[PDB]
Symmetry: none
Subunit: 126 residues, 2 copies
């Protein structure tokens, strides 16, 4: 960690995926991935990937989480970016809530690595 990476835009339109965070420039951490948009009558959007760290000792960006869905599946969370050098890996995004929940995103490698995210929350009839 020293300079910033460019974050990815969150999805906004129905079911739209988040955009990836950018790979860091020199001495820059990777950008955070965008969140996926909610889905209405359709599944949620996927998260966008977290960016890899740039040259030097840089951290990976966090992966975006997936969007929730009202009647369908959540979007999946995106992976975190890997570190540069001796930096820390990005945390994976969480899946969106839905039926069923989206899968989690993996952590990016580093020293230490980032953790994978959580699956999205699901609702069950009793």
């Amino acid at each position: 960690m020293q300079c910033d990476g460019l974050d990815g835009a969150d999805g906004t339109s129905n079911g739209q995926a988040g955009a990836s965070g950018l790979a860091g420039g020199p001495n820059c951490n990777g950008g955070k991935g965008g969140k996926g948009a909610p889905g209405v009558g359709t599944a949620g959007g996927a998260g966008g990937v977290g960016g890899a760290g740039g040259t030097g000792n840089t951290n990976g960006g966090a992966g975006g989480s997936g969007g929730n869905s009202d009647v369908a599946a959540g979007g999946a969370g995106a992976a975190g970016g890997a570190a540069g050098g001796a930096g820390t890996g990005g945390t994976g995004g969480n899946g969106g809530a839905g039926k069923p929940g989206g899968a989690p995103g993996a952590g990016g490698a580093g020293t230490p690595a980032g953790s994978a995210g959580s699956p999205g929350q699901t609702t069950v009839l009793e």
Copy 2:
């Protein structure tokens, strides 16, 4: 069923992430996530997420695989998208090879669910 125009773009510059696959429209499978680009000097990019299946009975899209790296970490593989209805979940992508190899992507939910991907190989010596 596979529909046109849903696959995410592959990364095309050093370390760039793959783009996520698009959520399917009605009766369409989710799109495949893009492949992460390799890294030279820095880490590989992670793969893009697979899109969720559309309404009806649809398959989730496969997650993209991560890029390799020469001296740094491989990019992570991406999660597969969830099925719609009674469809099959998408397969998770594979991690890129590197120091160490990237984490695998999780499978998407379905009946049956997608399998997780393979970790990237860790290169030594």
